[PDB]
């Protein structure tokens, strides 16, 4: 699974750092998402972070709408270019209504301030049904 995501800042630009339980899940996620993106004719800025992490870089609007931006309310927002890439990525990340504003035919999600308030804020996913 995706174990954790982070709002980071890099060269004064918002990123989403995505962490994976392992290097193999990271690599596969990288190849699958990139492929789905290019099939949809999108250049989605997902790049290598580390052994077990990737980054979604900032959007370059209006030229390249794909990537992270700060919305006028100060939320981290991620434009996925097309509704189909959103549909593809979100479940694999585990991102849901409790995490973000996600809209029917929209291509952009908005993280709740009470969930990711600012730079270096973290959301950790822990597997459901696990001993507690």
Ligand X SMILES: Nc1ncnc2c1ncn2[C@@H]1O[C@@H]2COP(=O)(O)O[C@H]2[C@H]1O
Which parts of this chain interact with ligand X (CB under 6 A)? 59, 61, 65, 69, 79, 108
Residue (15 or 108) nearer to ligand X, CB = 108
Coil/strand/helix, residue 116: coil
Least distance (Å) between residue 48 CB and ligand X: 22
Q: State the Cα torsion 105-107-113-115 to the nearest 10°.
A: 90
Least distance (Å) between residue 113 CB and ligand X: 15
Burial of 84 (C-beta count, 10 Å sphere; 0-12/13-18/19+): middle
DSSP state of 100: E
Residue (49 or 65) nearer to ligand X, CB = 65
């Amino acid at each position: 699974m995706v174990t954790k995501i982070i709002w980071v800042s890099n060269n004064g630009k918002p990123n989403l750092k995505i962490e994976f339980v392992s290097e193999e899940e990271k690599s596969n996620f990288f190849k699958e998402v990139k492929k789905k993106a290019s099939e949809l004719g999108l250049n989605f800025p997902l790049v290598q972070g580390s052994g077990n992490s990737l980054l979604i870089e900032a959007s370059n609007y209006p030229i390249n709408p794909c990537g992270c931006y700060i919305s006028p309310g100060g939320k981290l927002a991620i434009n996925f270019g097309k509704v189909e890439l959103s549909h593809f990525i979100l479940p694999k990340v585990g991102v849901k209504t409790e995490h973000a504003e996600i809209f029917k035919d929209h291509n952009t999600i908005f993280f709740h301030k009470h969930k990711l308030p600012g730079v270096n804020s973290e959301l950790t996913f822990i597997p459901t049904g696990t001993p507690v």
